[PDB]
Design an enzyme around this catalytic site. Structure first.
Site, PDB file in Angstrom:
ATOM      1  CE1 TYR A   1      73.296  28.256  50.207  1.00 18.43           C
ATOM      2  CE2 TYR A   1      72.433  29.877  51.787  1.00 18.43           C
ATOM      3  CZ  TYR A   1      72.287  29.117  50.629  1.00 18.43           C
ATOM      4  OH  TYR A   1      71.104  29.247  49.929  1.00 18.43           O
TER       5      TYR A   1
ATOM      6  CE1 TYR B   1      69.581  32.871  52.737  1.00 16.62           C
ATOM      7  CE2 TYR B   1      69.208  30.500  52.496  1.00 16.62           C
ATOM      8  CZ  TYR B   1      69.551  31.744  51.934  1.00 16.62           C
ATOM      9  OH  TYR B   1      69.858  31.835  50.592  1.00 16.62           O
TER      10      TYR B   1
ATOM     11  NE  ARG C   1      65.124  34.522  49.187  1.00 19.66           N
ATOM     12  CZ  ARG C   1      65.487  33.704  48.184  1.00 19.66           C
ATOM     13  NH1 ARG C   1      66.744  33.313  48.045  1.00 19.66           N
ATOM     14  NH2 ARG C   1      64.570  33.273  47.312  1.00 19.66           N
TER      15      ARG C   1
ATOM     16  CG  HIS D   1      66.345  29.117  48.272  1.00 22.18           C
ATOM     17  ND1 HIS D   1      66.240  29.830  49.450  1.00 22.18           N
ATOM     18  CD2 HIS D   1      67.612  29.311  47.823  1.00 22.18           C
ATOM     19  CE1 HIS D   1      67.402  30.430  49.702  1.00 22.18           C
ATOM     20  NE2 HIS D   1      68.251  30.121  48.731  1.00 22.18           N
TER      21      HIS D   1
ATOM     22  CG  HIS E   1      70.910  28.759  45.164  1.00 24.63           C
ATOM     23  ND1 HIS E   1      70.603  30.053  44.827  1.00 24.63           N
ATOM     24  CD2 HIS E   1      70.899  28.710  46.517  1.00 24.63           C
ATOM     25  CE1 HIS E   1      70.387  30.762  45.936  1.00 24.63           C
ATOM     26  NE2 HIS E   1      70.554  29.968  46.970  1.00 24.63           N
TER      27      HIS E   1
HETATM   28 FE   LIG Z   1      70.393  30.706  49.036  1.00 22.70          FE
HETATM   29  O   LIG Z   2      71.790  32.151  48.405  1.00 22.71           O
END
Ligand SMILES: [Fe+3]
Ligand SMILES: [O-]
Ligand SMILES: [Fe+3]
Ligand SMILES: [Fe+3]
Ligand SMILES: [Fe+3]
Ligand SMILES: [O-]
Ligand SMILES: [O-]
Ligand SMILES: [O-]
Lengths: 238, 202, 238, 202, 238, 202, 238, 202
Positions: free
Chosen positions: G106, G145, G155, G158, G160
């Site tokens: 991110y 990640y 995870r 995905h 969001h």
């Molecule tokens: Fe995420």
């Molecule tokens: O996230």
């Protein structure tokens, strides 16, 4: 689009006239076969009923006969769509209903069942379907009731209904029942219908997302009428 | 494709539930009845009456009857009428009635219908379409009423000629009578047995 | 026969105290585990109620509060047997019931649901089981009703019941439902019970041969209480 | 072998359905209540009272409470009592009550119970068995009430000594008070949280 | 216990009156439906027959008509219980039986089948059930026989039986068959019964542990009559 | 719950198997027959006779008939009679008969029954209950015999009034005749067709 | 058409607040039950966002933050329809998305995962659904990640997403996954959802006929929001 | 009928992904923020601020908060508002904010809302609807903010009175303070534990 005749009624999808388990049918059924005819303007036309004539409470059986208070019983909304066999909506059709009150008693001196009368319940309603074939009315869930066929016969809870739509050939009166009522499996009237899938077609389904909180439950019930075929070659109707 | 919703009998109170006003259930301001003549309606006024009998000859007192017919010029007050002729504007063409509880007689005040086109250029004799519902009748029974004073037109009617038993054709012909200037057509319906009325699958 | 203690209650056959889907249980359930004790005379004894004290209409909810007429709704008889887990009948046990009327309304100012009150229905009854553990009462079938758990929650129709029998350890309050009611599948209260077989144990069954012609339907519902074990070696109770 | 019928909450009207007389539903001539003392009943009269609290400290006003106890000599008025001692004949040993709607207080007029035999020759301290039903309580909660003026007997009680947390034992001891010659035992019940009352699986 | 009426006869559990495959029924069946009535003392009472009147060989078809010797054929004992639909025993009911001999021949000039007559076999017996509803008789296994329905029709072996019990409404005549007889699957008379489970209810089962060594086989056959319901509220019978 | 054992026809020899004495099968010392009058029996002696006809009008000669009735005071000689009145002790109330092979006539010598209570305080007109078994009859047919000289009582009978066709009620009324001082009631039974006798599901 | 309230949210179709396998939920979940309320204008209204305010690349995550070149990773288009529970399209709803880059990183100093940052990827987009409830955006497929729940938690890939539509009661934030990703079966966050059918409702499906040759793949993903019920009797909202 | 798409936590970067401008991701020209006052907006300006706490009392710094409210006259700037009153045209009614990373405080600059109609003719006290999303919160939590200077209106509010614990009602009341002429309402949110804020299922 030039319309032709209504598709033939499928007699295997309906009860036969003579049905010995429903005793009253024995003396009220023709011994001769029905004579089938090719349709004419007489069979493909029907009357029109104007919305002006209806009152605001005509489809609200809870309030349309309420005098000093509300009728006693389960508050329910019943809604659905009327369409023809080819899936087209049936617009501005007259839908009339009648039923017993919560005790299973009809509002008429003829009915002498001990189930109690309700001074605030009438038991008749009507409405016109809209452009999408939709209808909706509110009522008190009717109670089941005894009748003399075999001595201990009992009708499941039911609401009688009648439709006058676009063609006289569509004219239909029937009755719908409520999902899960156990009397549905023993009724000689419902059993006059030959197939299980058609018997299921008269059962209104609980519509839980459409219940109105702290107020009323709701049942969904769709109705299918005979449909007209379109003509693309010779138009013999006339 | 969907199957037609299955028919069920109207049951013992069909003539009360569909004619509440008459059973003293005053729920509606405007009520449907057995009088098709409004003041400016055109045509000759007639009274149609009779009894409906079960298989043992007993008149039914719980029957509900409706009729559907054309106006004086043979035009139906329906958007599905394709004759392109203007219909009488003070005519509904439909009515509903029950049998009198004591007597067992049912009736309608209406107008004698004009001839209506039949299929492929033919002409049908004047007729009124009639349907009967009652406890014990699983599916509404359809029949037609023709008139004994239209013998010429009746002899050329497509539907009447569809019936091979000359003897059954007569069950569909009502008898004209004149009760004090009023014209009355008597039409008894026999659901089962001798002289059983012809019923149609339309 | 020297009686010992009641068999242990099987906690897996009952709802747990904390059941988050039934919101009111969140603040009304102990955080500590129940402390199990070995039984003493305190737990194996219970009070006795004499038949003399009961009125003739105590088990007839149709007539026991009828003033100017009969209550409105479906006339039903409910009967069955109360036995212990080892199949022995439970004699002279006090069975008390309470319920809403046909509209789903309880006869108390607290209940402000719009379903209508019935001036001729009270909604409480009681009776003692007989020597065979049999009980029978007559009533009006209660209507389902809304309550605030999630905003649109609805209880299936039900009759609350309570039993005081031979031992304090048997003390039980519960509720039974009616065969086929579709709300049974969505009720958060009924779903606090962990297993499907135990949920089915609270459903009263239509008993068609026992309907009373032109009068009332009938439902059969049996109840099982904890049973005592017999002692054949050391009697430690005292 | 059968499974016990599953418990369900008494629901919001359990204190009205089981005490109709008090909710003004006059269906029964003889009504059950919270008074266990008849005129010839033996023993010292006491009043038992308190409140029932939820997890946030709010008293419950929809609770239904019953008690079961022995007579003055520690004999139960039950055919299952095997002591072979005669029981006081003017004593039912059971009573039922709800909470006052405004205040939230519940109460019983009863007699202080005598000591009852425990298992294997032991003696239990005087106690009253109590059960609580209410909306939100899935299974009736059982507890016992002991008396603070019976400290000697309480120290040797089999059941109290069954509880390992000395601190939880105290939640089962009611406090004696003397309101104008009347003896009163105050017993508050905390269903959840700090000083949570001990409940038993009996 | 105050008794009310007998439960309604379940017409779906019996043959219909008109059954075209059994030709003689065509002219001997009513065209009108049966009229069901609510019961009165006339329908719930019946006659009593005293044990004194019976002879010692009334239930022994092997010996009750034996003149110079024993009848020819398979020696069998038939026993069982008569109970009502609610499982209560039927005490002191009159059970009468009649049957053909081992050749399939009835002892009457009307029967002209070539199967041979047996001078030592009569073919009629009777008995009263006991306090447990038990009955037992001994006989010769009847042989199957031809009859004119379709030209080559054959009845499976069978024993005709008749019961007069506590109420006139229980009056019943029927016939039972023997486990494994292959003609059971082709009989138009047995096939008048609509369901397979009810057809099986007329088949007597081999009871091997009850055979009497070097003597007779045994068949077990239970009979169920309509049962009475108990009344706990209004007694309308009178 | 169990299902009732299914009925089957009595078959071609039902009138021989249930009345062996008459078919010359002398297996029993005491035989059941069609004579209900013992010497000290009370009431007026009557003879009940008739024929049973199939759908073409042919009398049946293989029929077996039984009747069940009350005594002269309308009390049944049955432990299930709850009137609390003493019954005539020289009356069985039941009898059985077959049709004469040549003639086809069946008969019973009995007593005219007294009125019996109907449901909810009503009074039934005098009647005899009758059942018919025969080859071709799959389930015994139940009917009742009423008397033409009891017109007043018949007009108020609960069961007769249960039948909506006034015309079918008459099929249940036997005709009184006086053959040399003997009173005879003629009751013909028509199983199928015109003037078909009413049968009941009791 | 007069609109009433939104249908009740079905709590069994969503994760519970307290979900012990997702460790961070332990201290961030209310101990008290949610208090359900009957809706008012506050709950059935929501803000409107004008199309004018959006830039041309707001729904193109591939180009909306591209400086010296294109972001590295799999080019994919994601499209679908937003409709309410009764199947009506949701028009002009604001759909916002955010995600990691191809390495699972991110774009924020807080994220210190060793997966590499992409100088040409931002990872935020938004758009308004059209009159048919349709939406479409383009992006780089995010990489899975690691995170610290249990030490080796991962995870699945995905994106969001967030929706603001017609009523505040419809407000919803969730995450969708990609067909076939094997991490979907092990994720404690996805497993907070109680039923398998609802877990499948968050999986975007490969839409092969809609891939753009020599350019990008495509995934189809539809979203369902709570729906409003229509009122035909009393309108209590106000 | 379809099921609602299942909720999932916003996750650890929900306050960065929905407020990119503030995390220095300059992808959009027009960005949504926590300031609802435009220059011509009507009503009294107020600042709403507070912290969100987890179960141990630690403020959350990864929380995302949105508010939805009516204008100064209690009208919502939404096509679904059916009051028929004109709404302030320089008011969006919605805003979004995150917590300051160091301090943990969140805030909005807005207008004090006017009273809005409640159900069946009632009037709701002034309130702002608020929703909270964060890592660990599986479904957005809904609550409302009421004002301590509207005690009279608050005492008659339908929703506040829906809560039976008088003590929990207070968790929804923000405290008015006056920081240098500016009006500020302090509203702390406690997700779990003592003085846990009331959350609604709307
Ligand atoms: Fe995420
Ligand atoms: O996230
Ligand atoms: Fe009906
Ligand atoms: Fe309840
Ligand atoms: Fe035979
Ligand atoms: O009906
Ligand atoms: O309740
Ligand atoms: O036979």
């Amino acid at each position: 689009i030039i319309w032709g005749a209504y598709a033939q009624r499928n007699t295997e999808d309906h009860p036969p006239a003579y049905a010995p388990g429903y005793k009253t049918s024995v003396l009220r059924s023709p011994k001769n076969a029905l004579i089938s005819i090719a349709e004419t303007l007489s069979e493909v036309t029907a009357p029109h009923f104007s919305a002006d004539k209806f009152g605001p409470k005509d489809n609200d059986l809870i309030l349309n006969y309420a005098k000093d208070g509300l009728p006693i019983g389960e508050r329910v909304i019943v809604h659905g769509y009327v369409r023809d066999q080819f899936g087209r909506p049936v617009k501005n059709a007259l839908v009339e209903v009648w039923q017993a009150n919560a005790s299973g008693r009809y509002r008429h001196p003829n009915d002498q069942y001990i189930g109690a009368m309700d001074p605030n319940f009438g038991g008749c309603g009507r409405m016109l379907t809209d452009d999408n074939g939709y209808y909706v009315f509110r009522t008190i869930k009717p109670g089941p009731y005894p009748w003399r066929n075999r001595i201990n016969e009992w009708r499941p809870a039911h609401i009688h209904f009648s439709l006058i739509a676009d063609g006289w050939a569509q004219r239909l009166i029937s009755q719908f029942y409520f999902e899960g009522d156990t009397l549905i499996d023993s009724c000689p009237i419902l059993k006059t219908i030959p197939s299980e899938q058609q018997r299921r077609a008269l059962i209104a389904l609980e519509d839980k997302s459409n219940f109105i909180e702290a107020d009323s439950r709701c049942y969904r019930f769709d109705i299918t009428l005979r449909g007209r075929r379109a003509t693309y070659f010779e138009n013999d109707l006339t | 494709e969907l199957k037609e919703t299955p028919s069920q009998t109207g049951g013992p109170y069909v003539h009360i539930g569909l004619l509440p006003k008459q059973a003293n259930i005053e729920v509606f301001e405007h009520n449907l009845d057995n009088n098709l003549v409004q003041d400016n309606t055109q045509g000759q006024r007639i009274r149609l009456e009779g009894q409906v009998f079960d298989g043992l000859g007993l008149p039914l007192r719980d029957v509900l009857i409706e009729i559907w017919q054309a106006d004086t010029n043979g035009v139906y007050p329906s958007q599905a009428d394709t004759q392109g002729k203007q219909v009488d504007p003070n005519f509904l063409g439909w009515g509903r009635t029950g049998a009198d509880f004591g007597t067992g007689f049912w009736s309608f005040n209406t107008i004698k219908p004009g001839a209506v086109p039949g299929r492929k250029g033919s002409t049908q004799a004047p007729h009124i379409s009639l349907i009967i519902f009652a406890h014990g009748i699983n599916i509404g029974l359809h029949t037609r009423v023709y008139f004994d004073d239209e013998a010429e037109a009746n002899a050329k009617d497509p539907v009447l000629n569809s019936i091979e038993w000359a003897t059954r054709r007569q069950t569909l012909v009502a008898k004209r009578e004149e009760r004090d200037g009023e014209v009355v057509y008597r039409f008894d319906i026999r659901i089962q047995g001798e002289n059983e009325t012809v019923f149609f699958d339309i």
